[PDB]
Design a protein around this ligand. Structure first.
Ligand SMILES: c1ccc2[nH]ccc2c1
Length: 267
């Protein structure tokens, strides 16, 4: 019967890894589609178009990408195109943002000619609510691809991944840089490191942090500090910026849990 539990455990752990991999593929595909959409905006924005055409392109970009909460454009040679667009409930609000290029991070993207990424942060939206997310920056180029003429900044809403992570389920965690919880069913965990939340189980947490750094995947067990019951745990990393080459392209991670007692209670 000890061998019964062992074969139950193996079966459960494998199915968790299968379920988690499909979930990672779902989240990656959301990101990849947004990146593809950004790539098309990046090409179209520097062409000779009306200012209103550019604005409406950025609005439609937001409308077509449910996980984007805002977008900005900056042009070196044009003060009239230093604009930020943010979701404003049913509409999209336009705002002037003249210092948009005068920060060290925007300059980084434009000097490097490469995709750049911020760390997760809370952005104040037009209605005064805060949205947790990350900025992705791409340099805007001239048609001859040798001169950078500006920058596109895309605010990806981490909170909008509730659709994949917390909608009608509470067994998933989205984890980011150095073990920060980006999204989980328990809202109070957001922006806190797993090293703090799960300090009661340092062996399991250090193992998760090592997998996060090394870009791997694994299963393990741990005593959950909220339920006080042992859980099965599967984790899997993926490159947050995808195949795109950049020093800012680090691993995100999705974690899936199952309470051990519930597996064994079924037998
Ligand atoms: C360490 C231990 C348990 C955990 N559950 C989710 C992340 C995580 C890290």
């Amino acid at each position: 019967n000890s061998r019964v539990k062992e074969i139950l455990k193996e079966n459960t752990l494998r199915s968790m890894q299968d379920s988690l991999h499909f979930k990672v593929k779902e989240v990656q595909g959301v990101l990849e589609n947004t990146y593809t959409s950004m790539g098309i905006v990046k090409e179209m924005l520097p062409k000779d178009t009306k200012r209103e055409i550019k604005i409406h392109l950025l609005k439609n970009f937001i409308l077509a990408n449910s996980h984007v909460a805002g977008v900005s454009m900056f042009f070196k040679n044009r003060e009239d195109l230093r604009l930020t667009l943010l979701r404003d409930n049913d509409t999209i609000k336009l705002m002037e943002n003249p210092s948009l290029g005068n920060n060290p991070l925007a300059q980084k993207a434009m000097k490097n000619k490469e995709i750049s990424k911020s760390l997760p942060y809370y952005r104040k939206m037009p209605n005064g609510a805060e949205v947790y997310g990350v900025d992705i920056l791409l340099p805007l180029l001239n048609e001859n691809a040798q001169e950078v003429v500006g920058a596109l900044m895309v605010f990806i809403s981490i909170d909008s991944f509730s659709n994949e992570i917390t909608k009608n389920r509470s067994d998933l965690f989205l984890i980011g840089v150095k073990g920060k919880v980006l999204l989980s069913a328990n809202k109070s965990l957001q922006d806190k490191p797993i090293a703090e939340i799960y300090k009661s189980v340092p062996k399991a947490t250090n193992e998760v942090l090592t997998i996060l750094e090394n870009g791997s995947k694994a299963t393990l067990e741990y005593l959950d500090p909220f339920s006080h019951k042992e859980n099965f745990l599967a984790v899997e990393t993926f490159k947050m910026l995808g195949k795109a080459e950049s020093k800012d392209n680090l691993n995100w991670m999705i974690a899936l849990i199952i309470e051990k007692d519930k597996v064994y209670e079924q037998v």
